[PDB]
Design a protein around this ligand. Structure first.
Ligand SMILES: CCCCC/C=C\C/C=C\CCCCCCCC(=O)O[C@H](COC(=O)CCCCCCCCCCCCCCC)COP(=O)([O-])OCC[N+](C)(C)C
Ligand SMILES: CCCCC/C=C\C/C=C\CCCCCCCC(=O)O[C@H](COC(=O)CCCCCCCCCCCCCCC)COP(=O)([O-])OCC[N+](C)(C)C
Ligand SMILES: CCCCC/C=C\C/C=C\CCCCCCCC(=O)O[C@H](COC(=O)CCCCCCCCCCCCCCC)COP(=O)([O-])OCC[N+](C)(C)C
Ligand SMILES: CCCCC/C=C\C/C=C\CCCCCCCC(=O)O[C@H](COC(=O)CCCCCCCCCCCCCCC)COP(=O)([O-])OCC[N+](C)(C)C
Ligand SMILES: CCCCCCCCCCCC(=O)OC[C@H](COP(=O)([O-])O)OC(=O)CCCCCCCCCCC
Ligand SMILES: CCCCCCCCCCCC(=O)OC[C@H](COP(=O)([O-])O)OC(=O)CCCCCCCCCCC
Ligand SMILES: CCCCCCCCCCCC(=O)OC[C@H](COP(=O)([O-])O)OC(=O)CCCCCCCCCCC
Ligand SMILES: CCCCCCCCCCCC(=O)OC[C@H](COP(=O)([O-])O)OC(=O)CCCCCCCCCCC
Ligand code: NA
Lengths: 513, 513
C-alpha cells in the first residue's frame, strides 16, 4: 500500500522522470526568483495596503482618493494613508492566490527534499538502492542543511500584512528558497546534453540570465528611487522625470514596472538614453551600474562569438586543407586538369560528409565499443567471402578489426592487368566493373557486398600468375572499398593455425577448380 | 521536338547551368522577401487607394486635397477618403508593372517546380537520370507539398484592390512564396565554395541578412506607428515626432520609408539616437527591439572576429614556431651567428610559402590522388636516371612514392669527401656544384633535374670506396633536393627481383666503365 511503497522507495537520479522532476523544481525556483523581489519592491502586486490621496481642486483644494485623471499630468506625487486592515477586505482574493502559489511551490520543495532523502548514489559503478544506505548517505552529507534552510516558513508568519500589530509585511523573507540552485544548474546541464542545438541553447540560457538580472536591477532602480523619494529630482521615477511620466501618461503599477525595466535595459546594455543622475548617490549607483553593464555586454558578445566560431570550425579546417593542397600544386607545377580533378574530389568529400577517416570511432571509444561497431558493420559481409565460410568467429572478429577504407572516383582503375596483387576488396557503397583491356567492354559488374581478389591474399605457391592481378577493374562512380591486406590476414592467421591450414586447403581447391 | 525533349528531360543538379538557375531563383526569392512586406505596410507603392485631405485656411477653413505645401510644417496629420475605384484609373500602370513582375517571378517558381519534378539524384555514386525514377523519387519525397504551398495564387484574387466589393487588398498573402528558402540556402552554400574569398563572402552574406532584418523592422515600426495612430505622440512617425518631420520637410512615401529605415538601423545597432517611447506598448516594442539589436550586434562582431582570427592563423603559427626556436637557442647558448642564420632561413621559408612538408598532400587525399600527383611530379625525372632507364613502370611508381624533400641554403654542403653515402639526390629548384676540396674551384655545375649519388644506392660489393662519398657538393643558392634512400630502394626492389638483378647488372657495368 501507500505506507509500504513510501517506506521502501528510493530514487534513481539517472531516470528521465527525475529529469522532468528537476524541470518542475526549476519552474518553482524561477517562480521565487522573480516574484519574491517583485513583491518586495512592487508592493501593490498583492493589493495596495494604503490609499493614494491626491490634492484636488474642486471651489477649494482638498485631499481625496486619487482617480486615474488625478494620476495623469501630476504637479506632485500623491501621499498614502494605510487601511485599518491592510487592504485585506479588498484584496484577500489576490492575496489568497499568491498564498496558493506559495504553498504549491513549497510542496514542490518538500517533494524534492523527500526525493533527496531517498536518493540513490553511484558506488562501484552501480547505483545503490537500499533505503538504509541512501538515507545514511543523506545524513552523512549535509544536504539536510540546505534542504532545511530553504524551507523555513518564516514568510508565512512575517511576510504578509498583519493589521493587528501594524506589520506591513516583508516578502523578502522568502529569499531563502533561492538556496536550492544546484537542482536548477543540474537541470540546465542536463538540458544542454539532451539538446540537438547545444551552442544555441547555451546562448539562450545566458540571455535568460541577462533578462533576470535586468528584472532585479529594475527592482533595484525603483527601490532606490522610492528611498530617495519619488518625484524629488529628474532621475528618480516620478513627475519631474518626464521620461517616466510624459504628458498624457498615468502613474500605475504597470507604468512603474515598465519604466523601471526599460531604464534597466538601457543601463545594463550601455545604451544610456535615460536621464542623467542628479545627486551624488545617484551618480555612484549609475557609475557602478554602467560598469556592470559594460561587463554584461562583453559577456553576451563573448558567448555569441564563441558559438559563431564553434559552428564554423569544420568549414575552416576544410578550407585550410584545400588551401594547402592548392599551394602545393602551384609550387610543384601540377597540370590544370589534375588540379581540377583534385578539387572536384575534395569538394565531393565535403558536400557528402565522409571525412576519409575511421579515426572518429577509432580513437575516442573504448575497444569494446570499437569491436562491437566493427562487428556490426563488417562481420556478415566477411562471413560470406567463400574462403571465410568455414572458419571460427574469432578469426573473423580479428579480421573485421583490420579493414581499411579506400575511396575511388568515377572511372578510376582499382587494378590493372599484370599488377602486384596483395589485397582483397569488398564493395561497399559503389559499383565496379571488369573491363576488357581497353575500357570499351564489360565482363561482369560488381555490386555492393561483392568481393574481388580473395585468392591473391593467400599464398598457393605456384598458382599460375599468383602475384599479378590478371584483371582490370574500374569504378563506375564514387566507390567505397574496404581492403583486407595480405599482411593483415597472415598476422591474424598465425594465432589460429587450424584456420590457417583450412584456408590454405580451400584456396588450393578454389584455384584448381 | 518540344514534346519529345520535355517528356524525356531530367536534370543533373551538379551542373553549372543549375547553379546559375539557383541564382535566378534566389533573385526571385529576394524580390518577394522585400516587396511583399513593403507593399503590405507601405501601401502607396502600388498607387494611393485613397485621397489625402488637408484642412486648409484660404477666407475660411475647408477640407481640400493635400498639396506638398500642405504636407510641410503640419499642425495635424491629413485624413483619407477612398476613391470609388480604388485608384485603378489613376495607377493601373503602376499596378500592371507590379503584376508583371509578380507573374515573372511566379513563372520562375514554375520552372523551378518542373526542374524539381525531373530532378536527378545520387544513387550508388552515380546521378540517376531515368525519367521514371526521378519522378518516382519526387513523389516519394514530399517536395510537392512545399512546391504547391509556395505557389497558391491567392494573392492574385485577394491581394489587389477590388472596388466592386470594397476590398482594399492584402499583399501579405504572397508570403507563401517565402517557403522556398532551401534553394536560396543551396545557392549561397554553393557560392561560398566557388568563392576565392570565402571568409569575406560569409561576412557579406551576414551583412545582407542584417540589412533585410532592418528593412522588415522598418516596416514593423511603421505598421506599429500607423496602428497606434500617426502623429499621436512623439515616438510614432508623424508631426509630433520632430525627427520624423522637421521644419521644412514634406510627408511623402519616400520620407516614411527613409525615416523608418533610419529608426530601425539605430535601434537594431543599439545606437538609440531616436525619440524615447511614450506609451507602455511602445516601451514593450522598443525593449524587445533593443534586445534583438544587442544580439544582432554581437552576431556581426562574432562573424567579423571569426574571419579576422581565421585569416591570421598561419602567421600566428609561424610566429609560435619562431618563438620556440629562439627560446631554445637562448636556453642552450647557441652562437649569435648560427642564430641569425636560423632566423634568415626561417624567414625565407615564410616569405616563399614552402611549409617544408609534403604532408599537405599526404594526409588528406586518397591514395589514388596521392599516387597520381606523385607520378606527375617525379616519374619522368626518375625514368632518366641511367639506372632506371630499363625497368618496369611499377617499380618506378613505388619509388616516386618514396622520395623525401631536403632543402639547403646558399653555400651549404650537400656532402663532403669521405662521408657515409647512402642516398641519391635529384636537383629540383636549385643548382649545385662540385668544388675541389677547398671551396675555391669548380669541376661541374649540376642544374635542375640532374642526379647525384646514384651508384651509392646500389651495393656493388667491392666498388673502390663504395660507401664513402668521394666528392664535395655544395649548394649555390637555396636548393630543393629529393632523396631516394638506399633502404627505400631495396625495400621496393625486393618485390621486383627481375628488376633487382638488372639494376645490379647495370650498376656493375657503370662502375667498371
Ligand atoms: C496564472 C494565474 C494568474 C492569474 C491572474 C489573475 C488576476 C490578475 C489581476 C490583474 C490585476 C487586476 C486589476 C488590479 C489593479 O488594477 O492593480 C492594483 C493592484 O492589484 C494588482 O496588481 C494585483 C496583481 C495580480 C495579483 C494576483 C496575481 C497572482 C498571480 C500568481 C503568481 C503568478 C503565477 C505564476 C505561475 C507559475 C489595484 O488597483 P485598484 O483598482 O484597487 O486601485 C484603485 C484605482 N483607483 C486609483 C482608480 C481608485
Ligand atoms: C510584465 C507584466 C505584464 C502583465 C500585463 C499587464 C496587463 C496590462 C493591462 C493594463 C492593466 O492591467 O491595468 C494597469 C494597472 O496595472 C496593473 O494593475 C497590472 C498589474 C501588472 C503589474 C506589473 C508588474 C509586474 C511585475 C512582475 C514581474 C514580471 C517578471 C518578468 C521577468 C522578466 C493600468 O493600465 P494603464 O497604465 O495602461 O492606464 C490605465 C489608465
Ligand atoms: C525596374 C523597373 C522599375 C521601374 C520604376 C518605374 C517607375 C517608378 C515611378 C516612381 C514614382 C513616380 C511618382 C509617384 C509618386 O509620387 O508616389 C506616389 C505613389 O506612387 C508610387 O510610389 C509608385 C511606386 C513605384 C510603382 C512601380 C514600381 C514597380 C517596380 C517593380 C518592382 C521593382 C523591380 C524589381 C526587379 C527585380 C504617387 O504620388 P501622387 O502624385 O499620385 O500623389 C498626389 C500628389 N499630391 C499630393 C501633390 C497631390
Ligand atoms: C529606397 C528607394 C529609393 C528609390 C529612390 C526614390 C526616388 C527619389 C526621388 C523623390 C521622389 O521620387 O518623390 C518623392 C515621393 O516618394 C515617391 O513616390 C518615391 C517612391 C519611393 C518609395 C520608397 C519606398 C521604398 C520601399 C521599397 C523597399 C526597398 C527595399 C530595400 C531593401 C534594403 C518625394 O520627394 P521628397 O520627399 O524629397 O520631397 C518632395 C516635395
Ligand atoms: C564615491 C562616493 C559617492 C558619494 C555617495 C554619497 O554622497 O553618499 C551620500 C548618502 C547620503 O545622502 P542621501 O542619500 O541621503 O541623499 O549616503 C548614504 O546615505 C548611503 C551611502 C551608501 C553608499
Ligand atoms: C556582471 C557580468 C554578468 C554576467 C552574468 C551572465 C552569466 O552569468 O552567464 C555566465 C556564462 C556561462 O555561465 P555558466 O552557464 O557556464 O554557468 O558566461 C560567463 O561565465 C561569463 C562571466 C563573465 C563575467 C565577467
Ligand atoms: C510588459 C507588458 C507591457 C504592457 C503593454 C500594454 O500595456 O498593452 C497595452 C495594449 C493596449 O493599449 P493600446 O495599445 O491600445 O494603447 O495592449 C494591446 O492592445 C496589445 C498587447 C500585445 C502585447
Ligand atoms: C537576433 C540575431 C540575429 C542574427 C541574424 C543574422 C544571421 O542569421 O546570420 C547567421 C550567421 C550564420 O548563419 P548561416 O549562414 O551559417 O546559416 O551566424 C549565426 O548563426 C549567429 C546566430 C546568433 C543568434 C543569437
Ligand atoms: Na544621446
Amino acid at each position: 500500500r501507500i505506507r509500504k511503497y513510501l517506506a521502501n522507495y528510493t530514487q534513481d537520479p539517472s531516470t528521465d522522470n527525475f529529469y522532468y522532476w528537476t524541470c518542475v523544481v526549476t519552474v518553482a525556483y524561477i517562480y521565487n526568483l522573480l516574484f519574491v523581489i517583485a513583491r518586495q519592491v512592487f508592493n501593490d502586486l498583492i493589493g495596495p495596503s494604503s490609499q493614494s490621496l491626491c490634492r484636488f481642486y474642486n471651489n477649494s483644494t482638498t485631499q481625496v482618493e486619487c482617480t486615474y485623471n488625478m494620476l495623469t499630468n501630476m504637479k506632485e506625487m500623491p501621499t498614502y494613508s494605510q487601511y485599518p486592515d491592510l487592504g485585506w477586505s479588498k484584496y484577500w482574493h489576490f492575496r489568497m492566490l499568491w498564498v496558493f502559489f506559495d504553498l504549491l511551490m513549497d510542496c514542490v520543495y518538500l517533494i524534492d527534499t523527500f526525493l533527496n532523502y531517498r536518493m540513490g548514489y553511484m558506488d562501484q559503478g552501480l547505483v545503490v538502492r537500499e533505503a538504509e544506505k541512501v538515507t545514511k548517505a543523506y545524513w552523512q552529507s549535509k544536504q539536510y542543511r540546505i534542504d532545511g534552510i530553504s524551507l523555513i516558513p518564516l514568510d508565512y508568519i512575517l511576510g504578509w500584512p498583519i493589521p493587528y500589530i501594524n506589520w506591513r509585511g516583508l516578502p523578502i523573507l522568502r529569499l531563502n528558497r533561492l538556496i536550492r540552485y544546484k537542482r536548477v544548474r543540474n537541470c540546465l546541464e542536463r538540458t544542454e546534453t539532451r539538446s540537438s542545438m547545444p551552442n544555441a541553447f547555451r546562448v539562450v540560457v545566458v540571455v535568460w540570465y541577462i533578462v533576470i538580472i535586468i528584472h532585479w536591477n529594475a527592482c533595484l532602480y525603483f527601490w532606490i528611487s522610492e528611498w530617495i523619494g519619488l518625484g524629488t529630482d529628474a532621475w528618480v521615477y516620478g513627475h519631474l522625470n518626464k521620461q517616466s511620466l510624459p504628458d498624457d501618461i498615468t502613474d500605475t503599477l504597470l507604468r512603474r514596472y515598465v519604466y523601471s525595466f526599460y531604464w534597466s535595459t538601457l543601463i545594463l546594455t550601455t545604451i544610456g538614453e535615460v536621464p542623467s543622475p542628479v545627486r551624488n548617490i545617484e551618480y555612484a549607483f549609475v557609475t557602478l551600474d554602467l560598469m556592470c553593464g559594460v561587463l554584461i555586454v562583453a559577456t553576451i558578445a563573448g558567448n555569441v562569438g564563441s558559438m559563431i566560431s564553434n559552428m564554423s570550425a569544420a568549414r575552416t579546417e576544410f578550407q585550410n586543407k584545400m588551401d594547402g593542397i592548392k599551394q602545393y600544386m602551384e609550387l610543384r607545377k601540377v597540370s590544370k586538369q589534375l588540379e581540377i580533378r583534385v578539387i572536384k574530389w575534395f569538394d565531393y568529400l565535403w558536400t557528402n560528409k565522409q571525412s576519409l577517416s575511421d579515426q572518429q570511432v577509432l580513437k575516442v571509444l573504448p575497444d569494446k565499443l570499437q569491436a562491437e561497431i566493427a562487428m556490426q558493420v563488417h562481420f556478415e559481409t566477411l562471413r560470406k567471402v567463400r574462403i571465410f565460410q568455414d572458419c571460427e568467429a574469432g578469426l573473423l572478429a580479428e579480421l573485421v578489426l583490420k579493414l581499411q577504407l579506400q575511396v575511388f572516383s568515377p572511372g578510376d582503375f582499382i587494378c590493372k592487368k599484370g599488377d602486384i596483387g596483395r589485397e582483397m576488396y569488398i564493395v561497399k557503397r559503389g559499383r565496379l566493373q571488369v573491363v576488357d583491356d581497353d575500357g570499351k567492354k564489360v565482363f561482369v559488374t560488381l555490386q555492393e557486398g561483392s568481393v574481388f581478389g580473395e585468392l591473391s591474399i593467400l599464398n598457393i605457391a605456384g598458382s599460375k600468375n599468383g602475384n599479378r592481378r590478371t584483371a582490370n577493374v574500374r569504378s563506375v562512380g564514387y566507390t567505397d572499398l574496404f581492403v583486407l591486406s595480405k599482411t593483415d590476414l597472415w598476422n591474424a592467421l598465425r594465432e589460429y593455425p587450424d584456420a590457417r591450414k583450412l584456408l590454405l586447403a580451400k584456396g588450393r581447391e578454389i584455384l584448381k577448380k
